[PDB]
Amino acid sequence: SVPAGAKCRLVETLPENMDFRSDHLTTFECFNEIITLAKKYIYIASFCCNPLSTTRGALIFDKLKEASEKGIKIIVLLDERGKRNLGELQSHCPDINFITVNIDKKNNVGLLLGCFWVSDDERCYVGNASFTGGSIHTIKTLGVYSDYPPLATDLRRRFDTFKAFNSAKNSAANLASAAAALPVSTAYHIKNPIGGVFFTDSPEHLLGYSRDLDTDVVIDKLKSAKTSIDIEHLAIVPTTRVDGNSYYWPDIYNSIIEAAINRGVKIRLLVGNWDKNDVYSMATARSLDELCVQNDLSVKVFTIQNNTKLLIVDDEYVHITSANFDGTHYQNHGFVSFNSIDKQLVSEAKKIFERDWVSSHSKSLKI
Ligand SMILES: O=C(NN1C(=O)[C@@H]2[C@@H]3C=C[C@@H]([C@H]4C[C@@H]34)[C@@H]2C1=O)c1ccc(C(F)(F)F)cc1
């Protein structure tokens, strides 16, 4: 028999200067458990890589340095745009194998956002706490940890597809025949979850034929929302700016409005503050302002460094990820998202969203 929730528990970062309190596992505690219980390997992936920026980040890096010195294979995948701190990292840990990744060499837009850990094919973390000293200590984050081996192995297979896009000689990032020979597999998806948990992936050109696109899964859950939509992402402005041009993409932005106007879903949105100089953010703000007064919508903003990417639907489905609901992310970027329908796991997620919705850092949207 399989366990309910796949042995999953919540993990997050609550800085001391912030009023967030919870009994769940902390991000700093989580990484020590992974490194201490590690016996075979430790695979880590994120965009930036800068652990020494805080005290708690430097302690995990020292525990990982000790791990690489005892015979544990340590491989760290970072996007080639976080290559500044590379010489600093290898200078402190020579035994850790750092690898620069460029998943999109066709247009150089897709970035590596896959923010997760995996060790011994038994334990694993996933969330929005990137391998930075801030995301462990000073930046509020949110993730999930599970010591269920079958779940960690299906997350290891996500790591295998990403490692192939290394910038060294002929590989999946250089050759097209070596990129087509990738066993891009997945053990569980929306049509066959494990213990009520499954993974969704991104972008579309890295799914193969078995994996699920996170874009289609999120929109389907938003269009199938009957009661409540609770989102805590950085921003949901349908327009992003790639290079010196703007990219309009309102797929997630419209499916939410379709819920609050046609279906009358009580929707609460907790996004970060925006720039007054950005006409795209201001026009998006003045639009949402007219809906909280007309339909059952509510919007609050925050100014703190927060990477949280949470989506709760009808107290029946929870979606934690590292990418933000926008066009640039769900079209080119590569990451892995957490999906679970376990009522007890979604309940603990609703417990967190309510906490942040009433926190002092969440002031009401004023225009
Ligand atoms: O979302 C609406 N408009 N809107 C966009 O289409 C975006 C584009 C244009 C302006 C900004 C950004 C540059 C991108 C965004 C924005 O606010 C909107 C939704 C519902 C209503 C109604 F109130 F009738 F319910 C009216 C309008």
Numbering used by the authors: 6 to 372
Text from the published report:
F13 is a phospholipase anchored to membranes via two palmitoylated cysteines located in a hydrophobic membrane-interacting region (MIR). Tecovirimat is an inhibitor of mature virus wrapping widely used to treat mpox patients infected with clade IIb strains. Tecovirimat binding to F13 blocks viral wrapping, but the structural mechanism is poorly understood. We showed that F13 forms a homodimer on membranes, and tecovirimat inserts into a cavity formed between the two protomers.
Next, we aimed to elucidate the structural basis of the partial resistance of the A295E mutant. We obtained cubic crystals of sF13A295E and soaked them in tecovirimat. In the absence of tecovirimat, sF13A295E formed a homodimer that resembled that of sF13WT, but with the ends of the α10 helix being more open, so that Y285 was hydrogen-bonded with Q299 instead of with N300, as in the wild-type protein. In the presence of tecovirimat, sF13A295E recovered the native conformation, in which Y285 was hydrogen-bonded to N300. Overall, we concluded that escape mutants isolated from tecovirimat-treated patients alter the dimerization interface of sF13, making tecovirimat-induced dimerization less efficient. In line with the AUC experiments, tecovirimat induced a strong increase in the PLA signal in cells expressing Flag–F13WT, a slight increase in cells expressing Flag–F13A295E and none in cells expressing Flag–F134MUT.
